[PDB]
Amino acid sequence: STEDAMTVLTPLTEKDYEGLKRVLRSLQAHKMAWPFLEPVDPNDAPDYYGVIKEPMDLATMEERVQRRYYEKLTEFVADMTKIFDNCRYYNPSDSPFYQCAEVLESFFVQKLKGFKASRS
Numbered sequence: 001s002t003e004d005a006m007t008v009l010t011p012l013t014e015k016d017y018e019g020l021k022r023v024l025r026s027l028q029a030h031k032m033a034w035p036f037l038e039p040v041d042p043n044d045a046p047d048y049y050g051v052i053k054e055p056m057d058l059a060t061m062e063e064r065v066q067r068r069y070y071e072k073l074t075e076f077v078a079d080m081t082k083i084f085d086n087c088r089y090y091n092p093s094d095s096p097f098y099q100c101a102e103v104l105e106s107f108f109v110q111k112l113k114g115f116k117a118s119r120s
């Protein structure tokens with residue numbers, strides 16, 4: 001689709017970056033975002049950093065947005081998806097963190113679709 005191709009191939013503009021900031025702030029404000037606002041502390045999760053190959057959190061993404069790290073929407077989506085995939089990989093499905101990942105990713109998907117639509 002056009003949105004698929006734009007996501008992979010069209011460099012993020014300054015207008016795109018304002019949209020990414022809005023998406024990120026929406027995630028940070030969500031009631032279920034608190035487990036993901038800052039990196040996992042090793043004291044909450046034995047072996048976390050040996051198990052999880054590419055840790056990610058919303059504060060690291062915020063730093064990257066502010067530094068204009070992302071060149072393509074795909075890269076921003078990849079970092080956000082690491083947050084949820086890492087959480088579901090490390091934790092059992094009855095963990096409250098796993099539950100938060102399910103809800104927050106669903107919200108992200110809604111906001112992401114809105115952002116993609118706005119790029120045209």
Ligand SMILES: Cn1ncc(NC2CNC2)c(Cl)c1=O
Nearest residue numbers: 035038039040044045087097
């Ligand atoms: C296993 N584990 N432990 C803590 C955590 N979040 C912390 C950041 N402040 C709470 C997540 Cl997301 C997780 O998966």
